[PDB]
Amino acid sequence: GNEQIQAVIDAGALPALVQLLSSPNEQILQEALWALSNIASGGNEQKQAVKEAGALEKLEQLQSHENEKIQKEAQEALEKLQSH
Structure with missing residues (x-):
């Protein structure tokens, strides 16, 4: 699969920050994930x-x-949104 590519740095705002999680394209998920x-x-x-x-x-x-790799990408938000 494709790793986090260093294309452009960003931050993220609104559901658009989450939307890439539901991507079919786990690869592009990972690509944009770097910024998001x-x-x-x-x-x-x-x-x-x-x-x-x-x-x-x-x-x-x-x-x-x-x-x-996608398992870490998934659990990334899981973890952090959940109270612990």
């Missing part, structure tokens, strides 16, 4: 979005993954 995943690094504002954005909803599609 930074949301998870911001505990307040960013990391709080994901729940409301539909990360639990988004997760389910990707849980049917064909790529193995």
Whole structure:
């Protein structure tokens, strides 16, 4: 599969930050993830979005993954949105 490519750095906003989770294209998920995943690094504002954005909803599609790296990509938001 394709790894996190260093194409462009971004942040993310609205459900658009989550939307790539439900991508069919696990590869492009991973590609754009590099820019989008930074949301998870911001505990307040960013990391709080994901729940409301539909990360639990988004997760389910990707849980049917064909790529193995994708498990970390899935659990990335899982982890961080859940209270622990």
